[PDB]
Ligand binder design. Structure first.
Ligand SMILES: [Ca+2]
Ligand SMILES: [Ca+2]
Ligand SMILES: [Ca+2]
Ligand SMILES: [Ca+2]
Ligand SMILES: [Ca+2]
Ligand SMILES: [Ca+2]
Ligand SMILES: [Ca+2]
Ligand SMILES: [Ca+2]
Ligand SMILES: [Cl-]
Ligand SMILES: [K+]
Ligand SMILES: [K+]
Length: 54
DNA sequence: TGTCTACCGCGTTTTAACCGCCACTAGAAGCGCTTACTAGTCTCCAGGCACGTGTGAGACCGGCACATGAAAAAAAACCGCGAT
């Protein structure tokens, strides 16, 4: 077993990719969620958050 | 209430929408095959949570500087009130 890296850290993100993936699966949005989707969405939430906080 | 003209109604001339048709093919959409990718499961462990604690940001207050509104009064101007 390799030592674990957060999906956020591989994406270069502060926002939780894994939490976002989970919220997509459990939110009744579709039957299946691709691996990119929460990465993209997490990034967008970070960008907008950054912009308001700026 | 009074003044000005922008809109409305109308008859005439102009325009191109519409319809029905035909000719051509881009691309919408169906179908079978194959695999990459996701769900699912198990095990493991660290990210993020609830909890606790301090200290400095911010709320509050008094004192003062300063901006600005309104009055009183001084200075312009203007709007008539009726004359050769
Ligand atoms: Ca960003
Ligand atoms: Ca920015
Ligand atoms: Ca096509
Ligand atoms: Ca920790
Ligand atoms: Ca906390
Ligand atoms: Ca101290
Ligand atoms: Ca502090
Ligand atoms: Ca200090
Ligand atoms: Cl994806
Ligand atoms: K839904
Ligand atoms: K495929």
């Amino acid at each position: 077993r390799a030592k674990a890296k957060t999906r956020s850290s591989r994406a270069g993100l502060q926002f939780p990719v894994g939490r976002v993936h989970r919220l997509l699966r459990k939110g009744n949005y579709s039957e299946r969620v691709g691996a990119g989707a929460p990465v993209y969405l997490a990034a967008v939430l970070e960008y907008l958050t950054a912009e308001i906080l700026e």
